[PDB]
């Protein structure tokens, strides 16, 4: 197996889940450098992994994983991380996220649904383009984020950059017209085809018209927002998805 060139061992180290990829890392001194190349750590699911599910696909024990792949992996891989799905996490703070988003600058798919995340988990995102080429951003349930997290997200996308294709602020009931008038800066979003604002009950249709007037690719089947509001595309858009839902915020019960 030693006569194989590194370009073939790299191909062999692709059908291995990250648990086997770290077992192989302590076989020889060559593999130890060869299982941390970066083409093997593109997608990482720290919440599915600390459950028995080692997926690593295209799209508690848990605190130990986020403390392991934050000093042992992310510094070495470390800029070749494409996705990061922290959805429905039991132990993920605004500190364990501020330190992952500082080591993954080529991120493409964030997923922070239902996490104890504040608008300080994006403090590492300040150089106007921090995590550009970001396609998917799911913050559905982070009720603690104000319109200050969106001032760092609208800066960490860049200029026309701004290739976001998905935005799911579904429950972040503290964002306002300034939280959406800031996303329409530099660009705004010209590739956005999905805008789930279903739960932000304190935005106004005058500040949502300004947002929709800057997302020309927005599909209207996937444009959710408050029912008690008079925003755009009233005869084609959708309504709030948080009716009869205890998980996410909603201005009414829908019962």
């Amino acid at each position: 197996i030693t006569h194989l060139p590194p370009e073939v061992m790299l191909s062999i180290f692709s059908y291995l889940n990250p648990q086997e990829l770290c077992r192989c890392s302590q076989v020889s001194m060559k593999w130890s450098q060869l299982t941390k190349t970066g083409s093997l750590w593109k997608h990482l699911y720290p919440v599915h992994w600390a459950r028995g599910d080692w997926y690593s696909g295209p799209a508690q024990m848990e605190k130990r994983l986020l403390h392991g792949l934050i000093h042992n992996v992310l510094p070495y891989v470390g800029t070749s991380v494409k996705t990061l799905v922290l959805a429905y996490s039991s132990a993920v703070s605004s500190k364990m996220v501020r330190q992952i988003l500082e080591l993954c600058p080529n991120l493409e798919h964030l997923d922070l649904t239902q996490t104890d995340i504040s608008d300080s988990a994006f403090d590492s995102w300040s150089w106007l383009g921090c995590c550009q080429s970001l396609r998917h951003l799911d913050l559905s349930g982070c009720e603690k984020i104000t319109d200050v997290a969106l001032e760092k997200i609208s800066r960490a996308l860049g200029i026309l950059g701004r290739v976001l294709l998905f935005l799911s602020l579904s429950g972040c009931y503290q964002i306002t017209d300034h939280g959406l008038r800031v996303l329409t800066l530099g660009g705004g979003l010209p590739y956005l085809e999905h805008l789930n604002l279903s739960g932000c009950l304190t935005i106004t249709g005058a500040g949502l018209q300004d947002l929709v007037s800057a997302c020309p690719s927005l599909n209207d089947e996937y444009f959710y927002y408050c029912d008690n509001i008079n925003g755009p595309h009233a005869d084609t858009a959708s309504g709030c998805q948080n009716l009869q839902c205890g998980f996410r915020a909603c201005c009414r019960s829908g019962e």
Partner: protein
């Protein structure tokens, strides 16, 4: 018609062009010079197997699963031949086989099955074993 491939041991092998059409390096080496082409990097004991696999795909499977059951000295030689001929199907199926040979095994017996030398020092071996967990 028929293309002539010469192994390392002086023997010449004939096969159809559509067979060598999957060989990306040969397909690119057959559109510039326009029969007796030599291949000094693959032995005949491996050519007999790579051509046997390549003729089956003239258009993991169980036929591949039974064909890829040989000694490691031959499997890895097959992989080194598929890397030279750029046969993506064979390369990918052998990578799948080898990565299957690693599924669910402690880092201690990997060295025993693959015959690896533990080229570690205790000051690094204790640093490598400590950082690969989280596991």
């Amino acid at each position: 018609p028929s293309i002539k491939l010469q192994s390392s041991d002086g023997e010449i092998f004939e096969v159809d062009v559509e067979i060598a059409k999957q060989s990306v390096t040969i397909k690119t080496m057959l559109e510039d010079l326009g029969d007796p082409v030599p291949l000094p990097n693959v032995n005949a004991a491996i050519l007999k197997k790579v051509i046997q696999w390549c003729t089956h795909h003239k258009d993991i499977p169980v036929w591949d699963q039974e064909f890829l059951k040989v000694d490691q000295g031959t499997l890895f030689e097959l992989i080194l031949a598929a890397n030279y001929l750029d046969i993506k199907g064979l390369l990918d199926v052998t990578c799948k086989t080898v990565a299957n040979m690693i599924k669910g095994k402690t880092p201690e017996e990997i060295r025993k099955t693959f015959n690896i030398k533990n080229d570690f020092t205790e000051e690094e071996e204790a640093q490598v074993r400590k950082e690969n967990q989280w596991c």
